[PDB]
Write a protein that binds this ligand. Structure first.
Ligand code: HEM
Ligand SMILES: [C-]#N
Length: 153
């Protein structure tokens, strides 16, 4: 689909819609995670010892916000430039996932959880053209982190 001027315009618009509600969209995101794979719970410091996903934990929120920002920035960078750029951050990202016990087969867990999360966020505006646009941008960014994990291992 490439990322036409028209597709980019579609991701920006839908990201703005997400940040518009972080405590919601972020706790939703962790539930769609534990739906797709329950075991994942022992991994997060702020989920261990708990029984349910904390709803107002600042550690949790600041964590999940950072995750979606990174996927959006990725899509514009693809329409403008044509690529996703690897920096210091994405590399420190890759280290911390390894310390914590995270693997690659974990990644379609977090993707579906994010496409389903954005399908929920845009509702009727949803198009093929948009699904195509966030699918392209996640896949392009995941390709880049998995790359830094394998490197931190
Ligand atoms: C494009 C895809 C992904 C993005 C953009 C992303 C982003 C992030 C960020 C920004 C942090 C916090 C880093 C810090 O500041 O110290 C982090 C932590 C973490 N990540 Fe991910 N991530 C991705 C995929 C995954 C996957 C597939 C898993 C596995 C379920 C995972 C599990 C974790 C865990 C356990 C931590 C530690 C949190 C703690 O215990 O405090 N991530 N991630
Ligand atoms: C990362 N979640």
């Amino acid at each position: 689909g490439a990322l036409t001027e028209s597709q980019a315009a579609l991701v920006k618009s839908s990201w703005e819609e997400f940040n518009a509600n972080i405590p919601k969209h972020t706790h939703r995101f962790f539930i769609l995670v534990l739906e797709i794979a329950p075991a994942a719970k022992d991994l997060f410091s702020f989920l261990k010892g708990t029984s349910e996903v904390p709803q107002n934990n600042p550690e949790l929120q600041a964590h999940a916000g950072k995750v979606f920002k990174l996927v959006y920035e990725a899509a514009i960078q693809l329409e403008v430039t044509g690529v996703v750029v690897t920096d210091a951050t994405l590399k420190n990202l890759g280290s911390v996932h390894v310390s914590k016990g995270v693997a690659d087969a974990h990644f379609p867990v977090v993707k579906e959880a994010i496409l389903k999360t954005i399908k929920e966020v845009v509702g009727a505006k949803w198009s093929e053209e948009l699904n195509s646009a966030w699918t392209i941008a996640y896949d392009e960014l995941a390709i880049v982190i998995k790359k830094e994990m394998d490197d931190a291992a």
